[PDB]
């Protein structure tokens, strides 16, 4: 009864929980947990597990939201460029005047400016706007599923 | 040599690897992995572990980037209001004309419109610009550390 949702909600923020702990938490067998976890991964609801890394602690002191205006014919080129840039942790094609939004993590202001100058070598970026993050109140905080 | 970094890199996209698997991959002891992971978690470099959930698979088909302009004095209450809405998975205070950027996941276009309309009933909001995501090229793809 809504076990998958409760299992997902249990792993949220506790993704290295043991099967024994998950089983105790959901009042089910360890085989039941193992089975449901396999099912959810096989169907692609759970894509994988990962640590939440504090890049700030590792010296990536600046996050920036980068907006770009690029004609559709040139989106293939700009998106490939952004995929090559690992510090661009999110890349969105979006409606509106700016049709790319990207979020990057940089060592400091000089680093961010360097990465942007490199990207602006692409002449089909006709307009750009950078917003520097002053407070990340919430970042990629996955919501619990309705049970 | 850069063990903590190789340990984090190992965990990326493999967040539930056994201590044995991690130890054999890094060619160190299970005891080494355990203590280094405990310290990385205690220093706040690893904030926790989580599954990568596919919300499109759970019926959350639509993503939007929401830009808001509020007075600084209102940033605290708007940020808390947005953090309360679990579907807002990112909330940033940023520089520029719009001092808030938020990212929300929604069941569909009608669900997004309803939620934004309610949000824009907040009298602290002086300007808004909602960009609907046409293609989520990359989303919270954490990058490997230099080693």
UniProtKB/TrEMBL annotation, chains A, B:
GO terms for cellular component: cytosol. PROSITE patterns: HTH_ASNC_2. The keyword Magnesium does not apply. InterPro entries: ArsR-like_HTH, AsnC-type_HTH_dom, Dimeric_a/b-barrel, HTH_trans_regulator_Lrp, Tscrpt_reg_AsnC-like, Tscrpt_reg_AsnC/Lrp_C, WH-like_DNA-bd_sf, WH_DNA-bd_sf. GO terms for biological process: response to amino acid. GO terms for molecular function: sequence-specific DNA binding. It comes from the Archaea. Keywords: DNA-binding, Transcription, Transcription regulation. The keyword Transcription applies. Residues 1-61 form the HTH asnC-type domain. SMART domains: HTH_ASNC. This is AsnC family transcriptional regulator. It comes from Haloferax mediterranei (strain ATCC 33500 / DSM 1411 / JCM 8866 / NBRC 14739 / NCIMB 2177 / R-4) (Halobacterium mediterranei).
């Amino acid at each position: 009864e809504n076990l998958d949702a409760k299992l997902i909600n249990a792993l949220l923020g506790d993704g290295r929980a043991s099967l024994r702990s998950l089983a105790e938490e959901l009042d089910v067998s360890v085989t039941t947990v193992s089975n449901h976890l396999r099912d959810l991964e096989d169907e692609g609801v759970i894509e994988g597990y990962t640590p939440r890394v504090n890049y700030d602690a590792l010296g990536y002191d600046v996050t920036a939201v980068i907006q770009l205006k690029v004609e559709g014919s040139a989106l293939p080129e700009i998106t490939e460029r952004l995929r090559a840039e690992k510090q661009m942790i999110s890349v969105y094609e979006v409606t509106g005047d700016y049709d790319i939004i990207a979020i990057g993590k940089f060592r400091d202001t000089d680093g961010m400016n360097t990465q942007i100058k490199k990207l602006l070598t692409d002449t089909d970026i006709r307009e750009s706007n950078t917003s520097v993050v002053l407070n990340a109140v919430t970042e990629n905080e996955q919501f619990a599923l309705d049970v």
